[PDB]
């Protein structure tokens, strides 16, 4: 649904702690800016993508204290108030599988200098003007929106999408669903204990799967891996000489006067600036892949969660009954329920 | 008497749905709503 | 329904007359393309390390040996300025394509049809949409049925009448608190529970939450009044 | 006759088969014929 927002100060990436370099970078003009506008456009869009997907209800629905859903046991996908964030059991599984890098949440020298200066790529990034910004909606706010969508679904069916949430008994909602797939509503009520036991058993396999296999969230970890690999490639490119007497901007100024240094420094500006244009192009192209995925996730939120979908194989293999959204790091997970 | 305030954003109005194992709400009337959508 | 549609179209005119930012999605496309053409013009001012930004002020001052060193700086930076512009425009053209393919899909599915897709043509149940042109865009006026004045009812999954469980054909069972009705599942219009409103399946033991009521048979009084026709012909024929 | 609808004669449909379609009104009037006929039988006696 989103990717890490990055702000890069190209004046500090290119001309790190030099006024001599900075006065040469002004001869390229708008190049330093146009990159900040491009990365700000990407960063602003990550909050948009997250709101298009999760902010699909303007009321925060909540579940009754009595849990009589006709035998269906949602306790693994509903909130858990015992926790410091109101995520469900399956959401806390999802948050353990994806290992985020630099969520933006404050740095204070004691967590980067000394011991934590050495075994650190995020430090080498931040010291070169590369910064990762926080999302507007916290992982608690995404879990509240997800809780509202799920509490609206189980208590109110599709009706909370099309208007005010109208209550309906859960086995009466599932009867309407069964009619939606062309199975007569008496087939639910004559089998309701079986259908409930099958749903409860099928949710058990979601917990067991997410506890057992490492690679389940591969689509989301591969987004975190791509953005981290790009920030690491952008740091390693400060080591390139581009034909200068050194990669280090200060070792030129330690050795050469203003006539000879400008020939070496313009090589480093030329290669560094080409390194940022390559990064910002690749990030603008990746932001369109994430947008296309967020617009799909917003469409599955609207059509699978807020509704019931007659579209074939749009919400898993089978005839669609309903879906439950679950938050994940930079993503959404749908638990699609299907009559097969 | 104006100033810049900073605050934790509200996600929406909080609402318990009146759920019970034998209760349903049915609309006795409707609104016909016309809404604009704009696309490039 | 007509007065509500006419009143709802009145709010479209009033909204578009009143608020400045309504077409923000379309003005932001015109703003991006104008900002890009202006950035591409301002980049002619950049020296790129040459003795001047102005291509003629080099040739006003330098011979063919020295000028080629200055001019190749300006070619290098200018050509990089166009590759940056054309890359950013190729990337923006894919955002506009993706939006135009959505607008073509909303034209097909909301204007040329009626859409069962939830929230694809505004919040509510889709009735129809009207397309309107705008500068570099399309505006859809999506018309939707939104349910408005709900009342709480007691409800049941089935009725027991004759050792048999009855379910609604189309609709749901509701109680006003004393009587039971079928109604349609989108608008409260209550109807007497008849054998035409309902279908039977199985005995009354298997359904969780089923309740007792009496299911009217539309054929029963139509034959009971035929029994009082039969019995009065028998009564009269006692007399001769 | 409640599960089904009629259309046309039996010559036009490829692959159609013979069966007997129950009429839910028929025994509901046949039991009304045995009600009618027993009222006639009893009224022979006076
Ligand atoms: C819906 O499913 C829930 C999870 O399967 C289930 O909750 C589980 O209930 C059992 C029995 O109450 C708990 O078992 C443990 O209970 C205490 C914990 O201190 C111990 O003394 C026991 O030895 C045993 O370990 C589960 O821990 C509990 N699981 C969770 C995650 O809460 C609900 O009961 C189900 N709902 C219904 C209506 O059946
Ligand atoms: C439709 O499929 C259902 C399973 O998907 C099935 O329910 C299953 O019924 C069998 C018996 O036919 C149960 O088997 C167990 O029964 C008892 C313990 O409860 C033991 O004596 C057996 O050795 C065995 O362990 C299944 O546990 C049960 N599964 C579920 C999820 O309920 C339905 O019966 C099937 N219905 C029809 C009409 O075929
Ligand atoms: C639930 O809905 C019921 C059906 O509308 C309603 O019962 C109906 O009440 C009216 C009177 O308020 C009855 O009208 C008849 O009243 C007397 C009967 O002797 C006559 O003098 C009148 O001319 C008229 O025929 C309806 O006959 C009656 N319907 C039935 C089937 O009994 C209940 O009152 C409603 N309950 C609640 C709590 O709202
Ligand atoms: C509904 O819930 C009540 C408790 O609130 C319970 O006594 C009753 O048996 C339940 N009925 C059904 C059909 O689940
Ligand atoms: C009864 O039968 C006689 C014929 O014998 C007829 O004239 C008369 O109208 C009948 N009356 C009623 C009430 O059916
Ligand atoms: C079906 O196929 C068989 C041959 O397998 C043929 O004899 C028969 O006439 C066919 N019936 C129809 C209705 O096509
Ligand atoms: C026949 O009619 C007489 C009245 O003459 C009545 O007493 C008796 O119960 C009837 N019997 C039957 C079987 O209809």
* Candidate from D25, D28, D36 with C-beta closest to C230: D36
Confirm or reject contact between B22 and chain A (CB < 8 A).
yes
Long-range contacts of C94-98 (CB under 8 A, 24+ apart): C94/A288, C95/A288, C95/A291, C95/B40, C96/B40, C96/C29, C98/A291, C98/A292, C98/A295
Question: Which of the other chains make 3 or more beta carbon contacts under 8 angstroms with chain D?
Answer: C
Q: Please, what sign has the CA dihedral across residues A244, A250, A251, A256?
A: positive
CA C188 to chain CA centroid, nearest Å: 24
Pick the residue of B26, B27, B28 with the most C CBs within 10 A to test the interface with C by mutation.
B26
Residue contact A285–C91, C-beta within 8 A: yes
Contact A172, B24 (CB under 8 A): yes
CA distances (Å), origin A138, targets B11, C122, D11: 11, 27, 70
Contact residues, chain D, for C226 at CB < 8 Å: 32
The one-character DSSP state at C216 is B
For A32, other C-beta atoms within 10 Å of its C-beta total 19
Long-range contacts of A73-80 (CB under 8 A, 24+ apart): A73/A196, A73/A199, A73/A200, A73/A203, A74/A150, A74/A154, A74/A324, A76/A203, A76/A206, A76/A207, A77/A150, A77/A203, A77/A324, A77/A326, A77/A335, A78/A147, A78/A150, A78/A151, A79/A143, A79/A147
Residue contact C188–B28, C-beta within 8 A: yes
In this structure, the strands spanning A5-8 and A331-339 are unpaired
Does any ligand 3 atom lie closer than 6 A to the CB of residue C151? no
For C130, other C-beta atoms within 10 Å of its C-beta total 14
Q: Please give, rounded to a whole number of angstroms, the shortest distance from the CA of C155 to a CA of chain A.
A: 9
Whether chain D lies against chain B with 3 or more Cβ pairs closer than 8 A is no
A144 three-state secondary structure: helix
Contact A151, A59 (CB under 8 A): no
Read off φ and ψ for residue A333, nearest 5 degrees. -115, 125
Confirm or reject contact between C102 and chain B (CB < 8 A).
yes
Distance separating alpha carbons of residues C143 and C130, to the nearest angstrom: 8
CA A145 to chain CA centroid, nearest Å: 15
Looking from the CA of residue A70, the nearest atom of ligand 4 is 14
CA angle C127, C131, C134 (to 5 degrees): 150
CA distances (Å), origin C106, targets B38, C69, C163: 11, 56, 51
DSSP A245-313: S-S-HHHHHTT--HHHHHHHHHHHHHHHHHHHHHHHHHHHHHHHHHHHHHHHHHHHIIIIISS---STT
How close is the Cα of A180 to the center of ligand 4, in Å? 26
Enumerate the H helices of A163-257 as residue ranges. 170-180, 185-189, 192-212, 218-236, 249-253
Ligand nearest to the CA of D17: 6
Residue contact B39–C137, C-beta within 8 A: yes
Contact residues, chain B, for A144 at CB < 8 Å: 11
Residue contact C219–D43, C-beta within 8 A: no
Distance separating alpha carbons of residues B11 and B9, to the nearest angstrom: 6
The one-character DSSP state at A134 is P
Confirm or reject contact between B20 and chain A (CB < 8 A).
yes
Residue contact A303–C120, C-beta within 8 A: yes
* Candidate from B14, B23, B27 with C-beta closest to A62: B14
**What chain B residue is nearest to A170 in terms of C-alpha separation?**
B21
Distance separating alpha carbons of residues A262 and A18, to the nearest angstrom: 12
Does any ligand 6 atom lie closer than 6 A to the CB of residue D14? yes
Q: A323 pairs with which residues across the strands?
A: A336
Confirm or reject contact between C97 and chain B (CB < 8 A).
no
Please count the residues of chain A. Answer: 340
Confirm or reject contact between C111 and chain A (CB < 8 A).
no
Whether chain C lies against chain A with 3 or more Cβ pairs closer than 8 A is yes
Sequence-ordered list of residues with C-beta below 8 angstroms from that of D37, at least 6 positions apart, any chain: none
Contact A126, A109 (CB under 8 A): no
Confirm or reject contact between C158 and chain B (CB < 8 A).
no
**What chain D residue is nearest to C229 in terms of C-alpha separation?**
D36
Pick the residue of A56, A162, A268, A302 with the most C CBs within 10 A to test the interface with C by mutation.
A162
C48 three-state secondary structure: coil
Resolution given for this structure, in angstroms: 3.4
Contact A49, A280 (CB under 8 A): no
Q: Please, what sign has the CA dihedral across residues B8, B9, B11, B14?
A: positive
Contact residues, chain B, for A64 at CB < 8 Å: 16-17, 19-20
Does any ligand 1 atom lie closer than 6 A to the CB of residue A73? yes
Q: Please give, rounded to a whole number of angstroms, the shortest distance from the CA of C230 to a CA of chain D.
A: 8
The one-character DSSP state at A85 is S
In this structure, the strands spanning C211-212 and C159-160 are parallel
Q: Please, what sign has the CA dihedral across residues A119, A120, A123, A128?
A: positive
Distance separating alpha carbons of residues A325 and A338, to the nearest angstrom: 15
Looking from the CA of residue B21, the nearest atom of ligand 4 is 1
Half-sphere exposure of A58 (CA within 13 A, CB side): 4
Sequence-ordered list of residues with C-beta below 8 angstroms from that of A273, at least 6 positions apart, any chain: A10, A14, A25, A28, A31
Residue contact D39–C234, C-beta within 8 A: yes
């Amino acid at each position: 649904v989103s990717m890490t927002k990055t702000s890069v100060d190209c004046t500090m990436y290119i001309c790190g702690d030099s006024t001599e370099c900075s006065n040469l970078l002004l001869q390229y003009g708008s190049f330093c800016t146009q990159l900040n506008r491009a990365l700000t456009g990407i960063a602003v869009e990550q909050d948009k993508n997250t709101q298009e997907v999760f902010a699909q209800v303007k009321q925060i629905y909540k579940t009754p204290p009595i849990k009589d859903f006709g035998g269906f046991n949602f306790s693994q996908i509903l909130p858990d108030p015992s926790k410091p964030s109101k995520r469900s059991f399956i959401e806390d599984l999802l948050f353990n599988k994806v290992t985020l890098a630099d969520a933006g949440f404050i740095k204070q020298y004691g967590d980067c200098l000394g011991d934590i200066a050495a075994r650190d790529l995020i430090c080498a990034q931040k010291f070169n003007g590369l910064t990762v910004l926080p999302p507007l909606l916290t992982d608690e706010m995404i879990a509240q929106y997800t809780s509202a969508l799920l509490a609206g679904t189980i208590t109110s069916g599709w009706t909370f999408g099309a208007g005010a949430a109208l209550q309906i008994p859960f086995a009466m909602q599932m009867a309407y669903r069964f009619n939606g797939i062309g199975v007569t509503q008496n087939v639910l009520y004559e089998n309701q204990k079986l259908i409930a036991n099958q749903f409860n058993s099928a949710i058990g396999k979601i917990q067991d799967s997410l506890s057992s296999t490492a690679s389940a969230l591969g689509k989301l970890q591969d987004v975190v891996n791509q953005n981290a690999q790009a920030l690491n490639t952008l740091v390693k490119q400060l080591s390139s000489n581009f034909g200068a007497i050194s990669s280090v901007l200060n070792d030129i100024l330690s050795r050469l006067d203003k006539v000879e240094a400008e020939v070496q420094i313009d090589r480093l500006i030329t290669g560094r600036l080409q390194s940022l244009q390559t990064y910002v192009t690749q990030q603008l192209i990746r932001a369109a892949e994430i947008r296309a995925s967020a617009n799909l996730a917003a469409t599955k939120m609207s059509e699978c969660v807020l509704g019931q979908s007659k579209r074939v194989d749009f919400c898993g293999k089978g005839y669609h009954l309903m879906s439950f959204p679950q938050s994940a790091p930079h993503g959404v997970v749908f638990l699609h329920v299907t009559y097969v | 008497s104006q100033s810049i305030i900073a605050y934790t954003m509200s996600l929406g109005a909080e609402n318990s749905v009146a759920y019970s194992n034998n209760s349903i709400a049915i609309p006795t009337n409707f609104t016909i709503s016309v809404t604009t959508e704009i696309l490039p | 329904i007509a007065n509500q549609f006419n009143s709802a179209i009145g709010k479209i005119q009033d909204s578009l007359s009143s608020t400045a930012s309504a077409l923000g999605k379309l003005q932001d496309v015109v703003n991006q393309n104008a900002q890009a053409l202006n950035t591409l013009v301002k980049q002619l001012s950049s020296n790129f390390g040459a003795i001047s930004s102005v291509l003629n002020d080099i040739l006003s001052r330098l011979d063919k040996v020295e000028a080629e060193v200055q001019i190749d700086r300006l070619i290098t930076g200018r050509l990089q300025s166009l590759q940056t512009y054309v890359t950013q425009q190729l990337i923006r053209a894919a955002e506009i394509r993706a939006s135009a393919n959505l607008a073509a899909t909303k034209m097909s599915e909301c204007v040329l049809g009626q859409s069962k897709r939830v929230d694809f043509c505004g919040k509510g149940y889709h009735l129809m949409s009207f397309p309107q042109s705008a500068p570099h865009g399309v505006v859809f006026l999506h018309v939707t049925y939104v349910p408005a004045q709900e009342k709480n009812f007691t409800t049941a999954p089935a009725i027991c009448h004759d050792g048999k469980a009855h379910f609604p054909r189309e609709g749901v069972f509701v109680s006003n608190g004393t009587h039971w009705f079928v109604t349609q599942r989108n608008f409260y219009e209550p109807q007497i529970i008849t054998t035409d409103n309902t279908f039977v399946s199985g005995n009354c033991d298997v359904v969780i939450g089923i309740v007792n009521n009496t299911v009217y048979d539309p054929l029963q009084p139509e034959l009971d009044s035929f029994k009082e026709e039969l019995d009065k012909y028998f009564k009269n024929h006692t007399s001769p």
